[PDB]
Scaffold this active site. Structure first.
Site, PDB file in Angstrom:
ATOM      1  N   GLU A   4       2.819 -28.364  36.755  1.00  0.00           N
ATOM      2  CA  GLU A   4       3.575 -28.609  37.978  1.00  0.00           C
ATOM      3  C   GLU A   4       4.096 -27.276  38.516  1.00  0.00           C
ATOM      4  O   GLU A   4       5.285 -26.972  38.415  1.00  0.00           O
ATOM      5  CB  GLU A   4       4.726 -29.583  37.710  1.00  0.00           C
TER       6      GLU A   4
ATOM      7  N   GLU B 263       3.916 -20.566  44.904  1.00  0.00           N
ATOM      8  CA  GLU B 263       4.448 -20.313  43.565  1.00  0.00           C
ATOM      9  C   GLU B 263       3.355 -20.078  42.523  1.00  0.00           C
ATOM     10  O   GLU B 263       3.478 -20.511  41.378  1.00  0.00           O
ATOM     11  CB  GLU B 263       5.364 -21.454  43.116  1.00  0.00           C
TER      12      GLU B 263
END
Lengths: 640, 628
Positions: free
Chosen positions: A405, A414
């Protein structure tokens, strides 16, 4: 008592069993003894009180003060983190000094991880240069604010480096002032000094002309030793007239906490006089679960596509476990799966390897793995991108599912694709990967607020050393102070960044958003993660275009997927707010204009960044183009 | 509910009573009794605001005459929303009238600032208002005050002065607003906001949803409501007013348009209602004492009239004290009438001294709006007389820090030999201090984006950058600029590193021999403990006349006073000191063709005789320069 807060300092005196584990019940009992907060050794007692005088084989105990054992706000209120007393960067032995720098760093990092509001660091010398350097850069380069109590020694003679033949004009104050200078005179609002009173009161603490100085200094705490008698009444434990006159003298506000310090090997009145000292002292101066559930469903489905084959045991890898609600969740997914699929037949068993980089995270993961998970899972310390080697080396089998995740509001911001991509050489061609796919979208918006707010960010003196988001890092200027410089200019730097905003005072210029950047794992073919596209829209009114609002959706597995895009927004989910790709200057548009957003996602030997800009075209085909923003991630550069 | 929604009243020629510019409180009490809190009132006053120039140079504008005194500053501050005289067209097609308009737009901004208004409205009467925008721009960007601004708009594009239906290609009320907003630099929408003006006929872009949504992304501050209805409001009116009313911080002003007057005065309320259905006493005292003393002295002579010049009336309390002290002399010691001359340069204050000379002084004092430095020449042209006494007060918390000597030396020109200066003398003082808090606080001073263009305290002034944006550059560095300035502070968390102060710069008035104001003194101090010297607390004493006098100095301090908090002459970095350290505060008070500055520093010499010296702070007034 509502106004006086009395901290109790942990000591080698009250080292119970598994105290590191049961901090809760600890502050509970202590609290029962009528005092609120505690100064606890941040690293853990099995570490704080370790003795470094051993052979080359005697290494320091790893950090072991679990966070999970106490909800965060509580940590923040009660616990005041202090550095292990054996740490001594200014040691006379080079090796031990280096060791101490290393571990000082580790404990600072961990204090940030636990998220404490206050910290103690106790000086043991008349000069602590190296300690100073480390602490100074630390505090000057943090993006948060926190408080720091520099506890001083009882008197000069207790200092490791004290020669009664060279203490020309030195005293406790000179020490404090010297440290304060050496850390660069950070704001006393956050950089504070704690005095330590004992039995023998130094002259500079009684002679008025000297106790006066401590009024013109960031005094935060008095650290008081149990060096005191039991005179009067029922042997009322109390405090001398000079002691009293002192505390009284310097008690200027009720924010000046007071920590009691156990020196005496008194088990007390069998642990009752604690409250007596309390009183004595007092009257002397008066979460996003939806995301996780979704993940669970994904898992169960995944176990359904393979489980049908009539499997027995399956290898699952969690990539970047964090504190691991996804570990607990995965397990619970195996349980539900078996509870509904394998009714009256051979259960499927899942083996769970969790891979993580941040050592503090690990600290939490081991505790979780003991209490909740029951030693089930294998904890592995590495960044996933290094797994392949140590995996088959240390004797582990390739996975079937790899759960991660690593999503930003703009999807790949990210670094997800690089993290997941680094682990491809150790997977079966069979290995299904969750999430499977995700895609980053975009939609033109208008707001004077979002723009004006992005642009007018400024950096206060106290934040002058905070590291930039670009390729630049803080440095030392002429005054030997840390400064994060910005050659491209402050505004420029402000505008060449993706942001994560709660879109409030805005408006869309497109009815719907468009796809920008998709990614699918496992990336067995190793396609380049770097991209480059145009995304064009059409304006239907006289408007000021301040930039684009960025989104992403993401398929964990097949049907299972969650999304942040407005048209398909997982109801009630808050795990992500939208990204914002801002224009340096509000670009004006009218009815008819076509807007070509040029965005390239470039990748580096060491980092990843976006370079974007816009091309406006009227109906007459005539075209303009804003300047390429974030040229070389100089203002926004996510590193690895 | 009710009080949640705020309703304001815009003034109009429709409601021009008499002497109104000298009767505001009652106006808003009446306005209040009709249930509406705030009000929009042209700041020059009505006489000025609704003046109409169409003649030659013969017609010059009605001077601003809206005095402050009539209302205590918090009343103004709470209820009165200031607005610029509609007649001011900074973008007039007539060059002369645009220049005139710039001058007066300035006078007016200056006045908004004077009265101390919290909000102010400005009506855009054109599709493009570039000069206006430049003036406004420089203004808000160089203000160190934090005030609000409503850019009021036209009913529709159609009624702009520069409206030509031949090149109004794709222009709209919003294109206008966004043009102006862009032209003032995009000053934070938290201060720089826009007002919509709802007419009788409702524009397309305020009904067409897609268009009206534009204003949800703009700093919508208020709705201007023309009285173009029946007491009712049409469907589209309603749907619009609701559609864009997102916060209750919004304000709404009543625009008296249709009714010559509301037939029933109660209708004036029907509208609001229907819409909602959507100080230093002692300084002055002591001065009066020194004055009565001076009239004892000079009066005893035997005369029956004495002329005194108050050089800097301000809002004039020292004046009413001169005349309440002459009033109280003719009974204790006598007659001896007193003729008062109150000189002043602040043009906004002159308003206060007129309304004062009327509501108080019975015109017994001749106001004089001129720099008290060229009065010698205007002393004959207007048939004046030499002064027997000149009463002044141009001193700061460090005494001479506000330039008293230079201007008084300006008045020295026509003075009689017999003129006694009140005050006669002053001297400055200084006291070594220790406090992390203060030093840290001074060093940490930061300028955020919205304050990038506030002028420096030195020789420097703002300037346009590469983006045509006003900026105050500090080429000596932010920190240096921070530490090379004198401050006034409430000493909060500090300690004194001495027991008693010491003398610095004295000044003697009337400076009759015209001695130089340039000074250069070296002060000496011995230390008694391990300490961190951060700088010097700065003080002063002044003798007004013989016996009477007042001073902020540590021991000799006028009690109960709050007239002057202490100065700080800080050092760039704290000085470590110990028992027996000799310290030379070296201060030169230099003066220039146009201003005055300080160049100070410190020398340290130990018990052994070693001599080091801090660096010269504030060289050539670069960080600190009181302009004249």
């Amino acid at each position: 008592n509502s106004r006086i807060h009395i901290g109790w300092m942990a000591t080698t005196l009250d080292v119970a069993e598994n105290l590191d584990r049961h901090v809760a019940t600890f502050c509970t009992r202590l609290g029962e003894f009528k005092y609120n907060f505690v100064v606890y050794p941040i690293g853990g007692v099995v570490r704080a009180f370790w003795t470094p005088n051993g052979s080359a084989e005697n290494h320091p105990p790893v950090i072991d003060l679990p966070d999970v054992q106490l909800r965060n706000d509580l940590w923040e209120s009660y616990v005041v983190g202090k550095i292990s007393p054996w740490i001594d960067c200014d040691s006379s032995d080079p090796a031990f000094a280096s060791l101490s720098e290393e571990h000082l760093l580790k404990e600072l990092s961990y204090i940030c991880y636990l998220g404490l509001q206050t910290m103690a660091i106790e000086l043991t010398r008349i000069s602590s240069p190296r300690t100073a350097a480390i602490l100074k850069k630390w505090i000057w380069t943090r993006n948060s604010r926190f408080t720091v109590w520099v506890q001083l020694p009882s008197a000069i003679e207790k200092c490791k480096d004290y020669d009664a033949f060279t203490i020309e004009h030195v005293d406790l104050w000179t020490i404090w002032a010297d440290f304060r200078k050496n850390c660069g005179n950070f704001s006393g609002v956050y950089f504070q000094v704690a005095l330590t009173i004992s039995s023998e009161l130094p002259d500079e603490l009684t002679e008025l002309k000297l106790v006066d100085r401590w009024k013109a200094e960031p005094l935060a705490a008095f650290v008081i030793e149990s060096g005191l008698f039991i005179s009067g009444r029922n042997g009322e434990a109390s405090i001398p007239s000079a002691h009293i006159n002192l505390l009284k003298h310097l008690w200027t506000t009720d924010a000046l906490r007071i920590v009691l310090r156990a020196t005496t090997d008194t088990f007390k009145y069998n642990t009752s006089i604690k409250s007596e000292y309390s009183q004595a002292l007092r009257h002397a101066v008066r979460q996003d679960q939806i995301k996780y559930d979704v993940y669970g469903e994904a898992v169960v489905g995944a176990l359904k596509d393979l489980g049908a084959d009539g499997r027995k045991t399956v290898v699952i890898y969690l990539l970047g476990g964090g504190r691991g609600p996804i570990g607990t969740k995965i397990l619970k997914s195996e349980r539900e799966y078996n509870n509904t699929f394998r009714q009256g037949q051979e259960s499927l068993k899942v083996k769970l390897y969790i891979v993580e980089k941040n050592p503090n995270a690990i600290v939490t993961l081991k505790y979780m793995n003991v209490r909740t998970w029951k030693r089930r899972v294998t904890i592995i310390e590495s960044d996933m991108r290094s797994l392949p080697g140590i995996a088959k080396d240390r004797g582990f089998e390739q996975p079937d599912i790899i759960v991660s995740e690593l999503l930003g509001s703009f999807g790949d911001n990210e670094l997800s694709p690089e993290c997941l991509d680094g682990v491809t050489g150790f997977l079966k061609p069979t290995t299904i990967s969750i999430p499977q796919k995700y895609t980053s979208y975009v939609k033109p918006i208008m707001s004077t607020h979002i723009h004006q707010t992005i642009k007018a960010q400024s950096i206060p003196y106290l934040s002058r050393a905070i590291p930039s988001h670009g390729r630049g890092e803080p440095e030392l200027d002429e005054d030997e102070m840390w400064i994060q410089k910005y050659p491209q200019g402050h505004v420029r730097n402000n505008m060449d960044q993706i942001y994560v905003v709660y879109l409030s005072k805005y408006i869309p210029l497109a009815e719907t958003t468009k796809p920008v950047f998709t990614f699918e794992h496992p990336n067995f073919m190793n396609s380049s993660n770097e991209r480059s596209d145009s995304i064009e829209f059409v304006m239907d009114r006289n408007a000021d275009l301040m930039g684009f609002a960025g989104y992403f959706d993401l398929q964990l597995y097949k049907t299972v997927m969650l999304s942040i895009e407005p048209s398909t927004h997982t109801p009630g989910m808050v795990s992500w707010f939208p990204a914002v790709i801002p224009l340096r200057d509000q670009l004006r548009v009218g009815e008819g204009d076509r807007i070509s957003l040029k965005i390239d996602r470039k990748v580096d030997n060491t980092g990843v960044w976006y370079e974007w800009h816009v091309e406006k075209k009227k109906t007459n085909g005539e075209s303009v183009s804003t300047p390429i923003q974030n040229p070389n991630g100089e203002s926004y550069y996510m590193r690895m």
